[model samples]
Target: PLELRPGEYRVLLCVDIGETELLRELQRLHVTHTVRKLHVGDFVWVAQETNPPANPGELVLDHIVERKRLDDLCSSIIDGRFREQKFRLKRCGLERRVYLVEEHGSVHSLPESTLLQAVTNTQVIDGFFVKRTADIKESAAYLALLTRGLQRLYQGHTLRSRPWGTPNPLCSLLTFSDFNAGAIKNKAQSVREVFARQLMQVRGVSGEKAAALVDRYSTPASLLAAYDACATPKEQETLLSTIKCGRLQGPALSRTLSQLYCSYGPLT
Candidate 1:
C-alpha cells in the first residue's frame, strides 16, 4: 500500500525462561522467538532475564500469573484477600506488575469468574482467564463445566454432574450384594455360574444371600426340588428365610426361583 522506508527492522521475543511449557509450545509451533525474564513495558520481539535497573519507560512489566485450577484462584481470593491487594508491592518503581493469568477449565465455578472479573475490570488483572477470547486460542477451545452448587456462590452460570460418570454416590450406594454390587461382569454365561461367581444381579439378592441359597441346595435341581416340595407360602418362606432383603424374600424369591427353574427346565 505504501513505499518501503530506508530503515532496518528488528524483532526480539521476551519470554520468562522459567516457563518451560510455554517455551516448549512456542517451539512446537515452529515460531522462532527470544527469551528474557521480563520487560519494563513494551517488548518489541521474542529473541530474549531478570530484575534490571528501573526502566525509564512509562510501561510496567507484566506478571505472568498462571493457575491450573479454579480452586487455587478461589483460595487466593478467600484466604489471601487477593481482591484487596492485587500484589504485595510494586517493582522497578513502575506500576504494579499486571497479572496475565493462564488457565484451562479451572475457572469453572461462578465464584471464580466473579472474583477474577472484579480484579480484572479494575485494572488489577490483565483480562479474561478462560480458554478462548480476543487474546486466547487453541487451549481456549477446551473447557470443563463443574457442579451447580458453585453457581449459587457466583450469582451467575454453573455446571452439572452426569448420573453415570465414572461412579456417583447413589450408584455406589445401590449394590447387588454387600460386596461390589453394581459391577456386573459383561461375560455371558449360565445363571448358576454367574450367580456363583458374581452374586444374583437383582435387588435384595446380596452376595451373602445367593451364597447361602447355593450352600443349602448345592445345585439348581436340588433348589427346585425343595421349591416344588414346599406346598404352602409359609413353607416357601421357611425355605428362603435366609433371604433377609425384603425385595427377594417370600413371593419375590418364589418368582425368581420359578424363573430360574423354568429356564433350565425339569430334571429327567
Candidate 2:
C-alpha cells in the first residue's frame, strides 16, 4: 500500500480562480494548498507524496467543492453552464460535493426568486451540499475549517493510490491527476461509463450503487437482458440484492430498480 504522510494532505485549488482575495484569506487561515488546473470542481482534497513513489503518488479524496459567486452563478445559469457544470460534478464519482455560493454582488440582473430556486434545486435535486456565505472571507473560513476537518478525518487511515498501469475499476485507489482527467466531459467514455451515468439518474441510485451495477452488467442492454432472462418478477426484483454497495447490500434498491426497469405497467 502506498501510504501518505500526515503532512502530505492538502486542498487542491483550480488555476482559473486567479488573483482572488480568497487566496490571501486561505493563507491567513493557514489552509495548506497548491494550485493546479482542475478539470471539474474548483477545489478538491488531495493526499500527496506517498511512500515508494508510485509514479503519480497523489491520491484524491472523495470531497470536492465548487465555489461560485452570486453574480457568476447568475451568469452561468443564464449562459446554460449551470446545468452542464452540475451534470459534470455528479458524474465525477466523488462522494461529497459542496457548492459554496458567495453572496457577493447584488441580484439585480436575475430575479431573487429564480436564483434561490436554482440554489434550492442544486441542494434538493442534485444532492449537493450548499454553503451560502456573505463574502469571500467567509467562504475562505469555511474552506479552512473544511480542510482541517478532512485532515482529522483521514489522519488515522492509511490512504492508497492506484499503480500507474492498473485498470481495475473496483480498486478504491484514485490518483489526483487520473481522477481529474476522468472527470473531463469531452473525453471519450466507454459503454459502461455511459450506463453508469444513466443509472445514476434514477431517484435512489447513488454513484456507488451505479458503479456496482455497472460492474455486474457493463451496459443497459446487458442489464435488460438479464432482467428478461429471469423466470419470475420475484427473481428479477432480487437480481441485484446481493450486489455490494459500499458497506451495505442493495436489496431495497434492487427492488426499486426492478420495479422501474422490469415493470410492464407504470413505475411505482
Candidate 3:
C-alpha cells in the first residue's frame, strides 16, 4: 500500500461531540470524490478540525450560498461587493456559468474533509484567527505528545507571551481545569488504546515507521497528562520512554508541533 495515498478519500471520521443525529450519520460514511479507494494496507489518517470559523452549511454549498447564509450564523459575517469576483458566461448562453474564477477548475478538488469535520464540534483548545486540525487517526499518547510542545506555551511571562491565552477559553467552556485536562489526555490516550492499535493490526507496519511515529508524538501528550497529575518517577519514566533525550530539544520540538497545530502550510 502507498504510505500516503494522495487520492481523495471521502474521509470517515468519528468525533466525540455535538448533535448525536448528525454525528451518527457521518461516522460510518466515507465520502470520496475524485480519489482512489483505499486498500487493506492503505494508510488512513484523519485530522480533527480545530477552532472557530465559518459555518458548515455554507461550506458544503457554494461561496455565494455562504454569502447568503453568513448573517444567519454570525451577524457580523458578510460577503459584500463581488464585482471583481465574477463567473464568466457566453453573452447569449443561459446555462453555462462559472463562479469564483474566470477559469474554473474541478469542483470539490480542494480538501473539504477538514471543513466537514468542523460541522460537529468547535475546537476551543486551538488558537483563534483560523481553523486548527488534529489528526484523528493519531494515538492518544501521540496526541498528548503534542502537549510536550504546547504545555510549555501554557506557562511563561505574560508580557512576553500569554501561555494560557488560547486554552483559557477552552477551560472555561469545559467548566473546570481538572476536567479539561482529563478530557485532553483521555482523547490522546484513546488514540493509543483504540485507533492506533487497530491500525497496527490492519497495516502491520514495520515498527520503524509505525513505532517511531507513536514514540515521537505520544511522548509529550502523555507527559502533559503526567504534569497535570501529581509528580512521580513512574510518570517520568513513561514520558522518558516515548522520546529520546536528544530528539525533544526545545527548538526542534517546537518546529515539529508547529506543522500540525499552526497554519503555516497554506502560506508556504
Candidate 4:
C-alpha cells in the first residue's frame, strides 16, 4: 500500500493539454501540473507520490476534466469524434467527469441549435458536469480553483492503494498509471466489457455496481437467465440486493434494475 503524508498531499493535474496556450495559461495561473500523455480525458487529478517515481503520480483520483473549445467541439461533432470521445469518457472509471466547454468565438460551421443541443445532451443525458468558460484564461482559473479545492479536500486523508488479487476485476492489482492507461478504450472490447459499459448507461448504476453485475453475470443473457430462474417476482426484484458493490450493497439499485429488465406492463 502507498502511504501519503499530510504535507506531501499535492493535487497533481495530469495534463494531456495539446495546446501550448492553455499550458502557458496554467503556468501563469500557478496550477501545479505535469504535461503527460493521457489515455482518456484532457486533464485528470492524481495524488502526488511521497517517494515519487519516474512518471510521478501515485494514485488516480475520481475526478477528470475534458476541455473542448467551441470551434473544436463543432468540428469534432462533424467528424463523429464527439460520440466516440463521450463513450470512452463514460467508461474511463472516473466517477466525477467534467466537460469544460470554452466559448472563445462564434462557430460558423455548425448551426447554433445543433451545437447547443450537443452541449445540453452532454450534461443532461450523458451525466457529465459541464462548466462553460469565456476563454483560455477563465479555463486556467477554473483548473487552478479545482486543483486547490481537491488539495484541501484530500490533504488530511490517508491514501492507500487497493490490495492485490481482489475479486473484483476493477480492483485488480495495477499501478496508478497502469490503471489509468488500461481504461483507454481500444478498437476491440470483450463481451464483459461491453456488458459493463451497457450497465453503466443505466441511471442508478455506477462503475462499481456495473463491475459487480458483470462479475456475477458475464453477459446480459446470463443476467436475463438469472432473472428467469427466480421463483417469484419478489425474489427477482431483490435478486441483486445481496451482491456487494464497493462498501454498500445495491438494494435500491437492484429493485430499480429489476423493474427495468423484468417488468413488461405499463405499471412496474
RMSD to the hidden true structure, all candidates: 23.5, 10.8, 26.0, 11.2
Candidate 4's displacement at residue 183, Å, is 2.8
lDDT rank, highest first? 4, 2, 1, 3
Question: Model 4, range 62-171, lDDT digits (tens) per residue?
Answer: 77789888888888989889898898888766657899999888656788887889889999999999999999989899999988888777756766565322221121
CA lDDT of every candidate: 0.37, 0.76, 0.26, 0.77
Top TM-score hit: 4
Any idea how many clashes model 1 has?
16
RMSD of 4: 11.2
Where does candidate 2 stray beyond 4 Å? Answer: 1-20, 50-56, 162-173, 185-268
- The predicted structure with the larger lDDT, 3 or 4, is 4
Please report how far candidate 1 places residue 194 from its true position, in Å. Answer: 75
Superposition error at 225 for model 1 (Å): 99
lDDT of 1: 0.37
**Residue 201, model 1: Cα distance from true site in angstroms:** 69
Candidate 3 local lDDT, residue 239? 36
The digit string of per-residue lDDT tens for model 1 on 1-268 reads: 1111113211123344544334444455444345544322212121011222542111111112232234444666666555433432222222223343444454454565576565556453433233322223332221111112211222321111222122211111111121111112212245666545543665556666777766666667767678778686456545665544433444557565555454456544
The 10-residue segment of model 1 with minimum total lDDT is 171-180
Candidate 2 C-alpha lDDT tens digits along 1-268: 4556555544343333443577778888877777877778888877666444465467777778888888878889898988888988887767578898988867588897888898999999999999999988898898888888776666656666664344221224578777876776434577877888988887888888888888888878989999999998889888997776764656777887887788789754
Taking all chains together, each candidate's TM-score versus the true structure is 0.29, 0.61, 0.15, 0.63
Collision count for each candidate, in order:
16, 0, 16, 0
Judged by whole-model lDDT over C-alpha atoms, candidate 4 comes out at: 0.77
